[PDB]
Amino acid sequence: MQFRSIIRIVGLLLALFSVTMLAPALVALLYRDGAGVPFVTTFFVLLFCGAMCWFPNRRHKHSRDGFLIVVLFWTVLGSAGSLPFLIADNPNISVTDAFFESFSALTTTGATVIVGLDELPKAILFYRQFLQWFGGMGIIVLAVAILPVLGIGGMIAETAKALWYIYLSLTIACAVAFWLAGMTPFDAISHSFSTIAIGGFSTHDASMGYFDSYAINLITVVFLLISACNFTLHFAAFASGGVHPKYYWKDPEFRAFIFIQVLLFLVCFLLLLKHHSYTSPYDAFDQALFQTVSISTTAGFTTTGFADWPLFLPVLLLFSSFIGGCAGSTGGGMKVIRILLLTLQGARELKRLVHPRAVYTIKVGGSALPQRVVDAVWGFFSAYALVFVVCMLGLIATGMDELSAFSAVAATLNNLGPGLGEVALHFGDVNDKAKWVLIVSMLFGRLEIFTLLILLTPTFWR
Amino acid sequence: MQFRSIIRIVGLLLALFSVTMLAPALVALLYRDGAGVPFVTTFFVLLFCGAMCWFPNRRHKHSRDGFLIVVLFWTVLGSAGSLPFLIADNPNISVTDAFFESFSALTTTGATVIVGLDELPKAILFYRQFLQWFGGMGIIVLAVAILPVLGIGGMIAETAKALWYIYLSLTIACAVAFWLAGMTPFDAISHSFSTIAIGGFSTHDASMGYFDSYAINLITVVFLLISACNFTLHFAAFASGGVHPKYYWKDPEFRAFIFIQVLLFLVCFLLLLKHHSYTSPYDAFDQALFQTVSISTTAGFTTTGFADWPLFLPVLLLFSSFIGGCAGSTGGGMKVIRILLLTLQGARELKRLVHPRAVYTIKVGGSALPQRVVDAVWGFFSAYALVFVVCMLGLIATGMDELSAFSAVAATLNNLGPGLGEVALHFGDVNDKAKWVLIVSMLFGRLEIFTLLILLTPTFWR
Ligand SMILES: [K+]
Ligand SMILES: [K+]
Secondary structure, eight states, X not given: OOHHHHHHHHHHHHHHHHTTTTTTSSSSSSSOSSOOHHHHHHHHHHHXXXXXXXXXXXXXXXXXXXXXXXXXXXXXXXXXXXXXXXXXXXXXXXXXXXXHHHHHHHTTOXXXXXXXXXGSOTTHHHHHHHHXXXXXXXXXXXXXXXXXXXXXXTOOTHHHHHHHHHHHHHHHHHHHHHTTSOOOHHHHHHHHHHHHTTOOOOSSTTGGGSOOOHHHHHHHHHHHHHHTBOHHHHTTTTSTTOOHHHHHHHSHHHHHHHHHHHHHHHHHHHHHHHTTOSSSHHHHHHHHHHHHHHHHTTOOOOSOOOSSOOTHHHHHHHHHTTXXXXXXXXXXXXXXXXXXXXXXXXXXXXXXXXXXXXXXXXXXXXXXXXTTTXXXXXXXXXXXXXXXXXXXXXXXXXXXXXXXXXXXXXXXXXXXXOOOSXXXXXXXXXXXXXXXXXXXXXXXXXXXXXXXXXXXXXXXXX | OXXXXXXXXXHHHHHHHXXXXXXXXXXXSSSOOSOOHHHHHHHHHHHHHHHHHHTTTOOOOOOHHHHHHHHHHHHTHHHHXXXXXXXXXXXXXXXXXHHHHHHHHHTTOOOOOOOOGGGXXXXXXXXXXXXHHHHHHHHHHTTTTHHHHSOSTTOOTHHHHHHHHHHHXXXXXXXXXXXXXXXXXXXXXXXXXXXXTTOOOOSSTTGGGSOOOHHHHHHHHHHHHHHTBOXXXXXXXXXXXXXXXXXXXXSHXXXXXXXXXXXXXXXXXXXXXXXXXXXXXXXXXXXXXXXXXXXXXXXXXXXXXXXXXXXXXXXXXXXXXXXXXXXXSSOOSSOHHHHHHHHHHHHHHHHHHHSSSSOOOOBSSSSBOOTTTHHHHHHHHHHHHHHHXXXXXXXXXXXXXXXXXXXXXXXXXXXXXXXXXXXXXXXXTSOHHHHHHHHHHHHHHHTXXXXXXXXXXXXXXX
């Protein structure tokens, strides 16, 4: 087991986290407004705690450890990251609310309990976006860095930098475009933070409701679509050539993400027209395209409130939220390939009933899928259902009413952010226990459900 | 394919159905009350249509036919059985309402759209119960009769009579007991019809709310539990003497059904106590014990309205509605063995993550399950979820609101069918399209989802 060498990495990570508190404290002296005293207190207590772990250890005793690591990386960082939200009496908020905000930020869930954030320190807002960006690193270097500790192919740090490039040259390349459709520079850095990590956080209390310019809406769209799609596939970029064209339409995962996106928008738009839910058919186009792309790819950004929207639309959207993101992106539904595979496998299951003496094989690209991963997919989907209904009961038990709890889990297990059900979105004054439960829900939502469930099976130890 | 020999059995069934219209027409002349003109009109149009099918055929050209038949037996009979509810202007009701009532009746769904049935002809009420009883035959002789046409073991009419005996000596043995806790004989036969076929229909508009005597509540409980339990397992009754005892606690399906029932009751009761939802700690026991068994074993009978019940309870009940009935009984959730197996399979999936080079096998009784049935189970669960969310969308689109459509599907896909969500139960005045949707929902719910799904795959033909 050797937790003694695991704690080395934990403390090392706390120090590495401390060196990111100097990032919105450098906005606590730049932008004149508010208080950044906490951020510099935090940079201290964290560096101290972390190094108080790293130093009494120093042992690289390089399975059961890998999981425990990728649960500590969140459980600790998302806990430590609730410290600015505590000492700071600028948005003075409850400890549980602080935790909810920190975890929701770090998970790239994006569901706030701080109302009235439009008028707060330019730092405590920047921290909010920076968290999303930073966790948005984890969620994609953990689609590579796990291999040494864990198994994807158990079911190379060449790409640790090479990914950070695709990420940086995306947030920057977005910031320019955002501030070219005219946000304040601050808002265009802090909204690329949110839009690339597919998180949903904003500076405006109405998210993407500042400037109804189809410029920013239809920018957020294309940068979401880019961000919501398989950084290893993007990796056909720095790998010299810019021979992008064919690689995307090669992989059937992406091909499916595109069919899904198209169909979903199409139906949404067409119903928004049929229903006369928008004055101009153009605004219908806008709001439809932005809402489907944002909500289904696990983004969270809202440009409307579904005022004129037929209930069928926010419901079907909250459902399509279960399928968002080429696997190994910054999204976090039961990722696209999961649904692809699922439909394939079930299709088979329907075929076998007809001719049962027949040999049907699951075909993805060319090679067949093994009956060890099909089992894994099905088991995952089931587990997902379990977790969802369990936390739905947990919320109804917390005190919450039925539909609000349904929306809540459906928003924290996919890591959405919006209530999205029947305009019951706002978490601020929800039950406290509910806040904790929902935090759990988004920890599950991040760890793809299994790598936490196994933590409490006896079989894990030892 | 040869549909030509299929029509023989279809018409033969319309005639066999005609000769059961003389059964509540024999109550339209016995009990002085009401109008039985329809039942004798129906006995004619049905005998005529049926024989107009059987006669121009006569060919016993003894898979895909087995399926097409076991969809015809419901789709045809449940349509034909909507004929009394049409011509009769005593509860004069819309055609779609008539179909809803007939299909819900024959399915053992148990969800009425006729409010105020307390004051109706003693025949049209008896027809309502008789339907449930007759379908309650189908749902258990199709756990035998299918084998020649189809496959359970593709994934003997010795027992065709032998089942009808365990069924008859149960409805009779219940009718007596009901009329010994003092119902009118009519109400004690027509409630054994419903309580054995696990259907949920009643004579009283408040179902089991006539006489809050724990006598009848705790009779209905004990006859539900028996009826809700594996007639093939019961078959250890007529064969040899009363050597029942060991057989039950041998089979782990039943062994699981008992744990489930107990745990469910326990939590329910204990919460009805903690919440002070009942004046005396006796009525708490009563209502808990009756409600868990009724709602979870797919019965439908209600003795309360969940006035003081903590919301957590009707919700958890509506969910436990998904798993009800020893497999091959009169229930119709995703039957108990399914959930047992599912949990086993997922537990396994959770084990493989830890030690991945290991050989884990699924164990039920003694022999392991083959990896052709685990696949089938998982596929079934997935399909189930799919169907549910699809019909929930179909209903939210029909016009219904979100939570109501949810309760509706969750009640018709398992065949409960009380609303049960947050006191929005009553189907009578729901949208008209929605009624059709719900009929589909309960056809799926009856046919275990696959054996109708495959009917619309191209692969089925030919
Ligand atoms: K999000
Ligand atoms: K029922």
